[PDB]
Amino acid sequence: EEVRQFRRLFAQLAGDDMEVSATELMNILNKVVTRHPDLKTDGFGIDTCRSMVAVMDSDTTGKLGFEEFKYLWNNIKKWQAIYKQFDVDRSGTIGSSELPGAFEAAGFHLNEHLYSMIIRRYSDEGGNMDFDNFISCLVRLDAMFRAFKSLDKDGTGQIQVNIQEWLQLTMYS
Amino acid sequence: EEVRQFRRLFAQLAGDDMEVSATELMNILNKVVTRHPDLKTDGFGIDTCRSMVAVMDSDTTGKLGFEEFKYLWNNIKKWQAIYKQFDVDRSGTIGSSELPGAFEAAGFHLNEHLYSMIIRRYSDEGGNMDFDNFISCLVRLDAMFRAFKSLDKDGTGQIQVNIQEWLQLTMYS
Ligand SMILES: [Ca+2]
Ligand SMILES: [Ca+2]
Ligand SMILES: [Ca+2]
Ligand SMILES: [Ca+2]
Ligand SMILES: [Ca+2]
Ligand SMILES: [Ca+2]
Ligand SMILES: [Ca+2]
Ligand SMILES: [Ca+2]
Numbered sequence: 001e002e003v004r005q006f007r008r009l010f011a012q013l014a015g016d017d018m019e020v021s022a023t024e025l026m027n028i029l030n031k032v033v034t035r036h037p038d039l040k041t042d043g044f045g046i047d048t049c050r051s052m053v054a055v056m057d058s059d060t061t062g063k064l065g066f067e068e069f070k071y072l073w074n075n076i077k078k079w080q081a082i083y084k085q086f087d088v089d090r091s092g093t094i095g096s097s098e099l100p101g102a103f104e105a106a107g108f109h110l111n112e113h114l115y116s117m118i119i120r121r122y123s124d125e126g127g128n129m130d131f132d133n134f135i136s137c138l139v140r141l142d143a144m145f146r147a148f149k150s151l152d153k154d155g156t157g158q159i160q161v162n163i164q165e166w167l168q169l170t171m172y173s
Numbered sequence: 174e175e176v177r178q179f180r181r182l183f184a185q186l187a188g189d190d191m192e193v194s195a196t197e198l199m200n201i202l203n204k205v206v207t208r209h210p211d212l213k214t215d216g217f218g219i220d221t222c223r224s225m226v227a228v229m230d231s232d233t234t235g236k237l238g239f240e241e242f243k244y245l246w247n248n249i250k251k252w253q254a255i256y257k258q259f260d261v262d263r264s265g266t267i268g269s270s271e272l273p274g275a276f277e278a279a280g281f282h283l284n285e286h287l288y289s290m291i292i293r294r295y296s297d298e299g300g301n302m303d304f305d306n307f308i309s310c311l312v313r314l315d316a317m318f319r320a321f322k323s324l325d326k327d328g329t330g331q332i333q334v335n336i337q338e339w340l341q342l343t344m345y346s
Contacts, residue, residue: 021298047309048220054294062293114337117345120235121227125194136220137344144343148336160333163321164287170317170343171310172290 006073010066019063022050029076033131038084040092041131048136055143055173072139079138082106083131094134096127106138108145140173179246183239192236195223202249206304211257213265214304221309228316228346245312252311255279256304267307269300279311281318313346 013028014020020028026049033041056068064072086102087094094102100115110118122137123129129137147169151159161169186201187193193201199222206214229241237245259275260267267275273288283291295310296302302310320342324332334342 042219045218045220046215047218047306050294057293060290060293110340111337114340114344117233117341120230120233121223121345133220141340141344144340145336148339158333158335159339160331162331163318164284166321166332167283167287167314167317168290170346171287171314172294173343 006070007066010069014064014066014069017063019061019065020053020069021063022046022053025049025053025064029132036080038090038092039080039131041133044132044136048132051173052136052139055140057172060172075139075142076135079106079135080131083134091128093128093130095129096123099123099129102134103138103141108138108141143173179243180239183242187237187239187242190236192234192238193226193242194236195219195226198222198226198237202305209253211263211265212253212304214306217305217309221305224346225309225312228313230345233345248312248315249308252279252308253304256307264301266301266303268302269296272296272302275307276311276314281311281314316346 010020011018013024015024023046026044026046029044029049033039033044052072053062053064056064056072058068059065082102082105083094086098086105088098089095096119099119100110103110103115103118118137119127119129122133148159151161183193184191186197188197196219199217199219202217202222206212206217225245226235226237229237229245231241232238255275255278256267259271259278261271262268269292272292273283276283276288276291291310292300292302295306321332324334
């Protein structure tokens, strides 16, 4: 069964301390993207992986346990499919005019101002976003959405935080 | 005069569009750290530089204007001196027990929980933080402190933000 083998894959990757570190994540992600040249990327750098691990480290162990990893992994599989689905011109990258569609297909409805911010931070000089940038952006985006929602359970449209919560949320990412 | 030559240095680095991009920043920072082997680092990666630029891009031009760059540059000079001052064992890295002193010397008084979060995100398996990590952490930390303060001018100890402000603040960094 697929479930059983994924479980084994995690155990194999996590190794000795049984959790996946940012370095362990980087290695499996780069080794996997290489098998997909149709996904333009300069690779998953260590800093990007430490950001993805932190944002996914809900139990604050510093690394990814099975569930955290499973969630991340499935999200990546889903976003990888979307990435290719919306790269209509086969540039191997998500361009400025393909981004809104890709994000909305991933379940994220942002506005013009937010999209421009995203492009400025995760896209290149030509408004192009490669695969590792696309994936890390969405991992972070999904996480920031979840964080806001969990802090606004009554749906008031606003959250209130002190400096310690603020720094924990913004720095550990 | 030093002021005049720094102004020229910025103009030279910013080039054609007269602002310093993340790539332009990365290049000058790496070319400068190399002249200091006493500063252990795997170098300033592009993703780290895009994070530093975004967090410093107060006018949201996507790049660093003279003032933004000047502020960043002076901060780095100041933190570089502190980095060496507190690396008492000359490991070329700021270790777990040197961190609190370094940060407090930089004007940041955090608590145990915040420091542990920092170590988990910016230090290595051995609790060691290299130069590029140290600098990018403080750039971000200083920025998150300023952002909170500007949103809490009455000093109530809390800020209240909607989802759009939240995402702008957390994603553009
Ligand atoms: Ca491990
Ligand atoms: Ca964890
Ligand atoms: Ca495309
Ligand atoms: Ca990239
Ligand atoms: Ca420029
Ligand atoms: Ca700017
Ligand atoms: Ca040291
Ligand atoms: Ca580093």
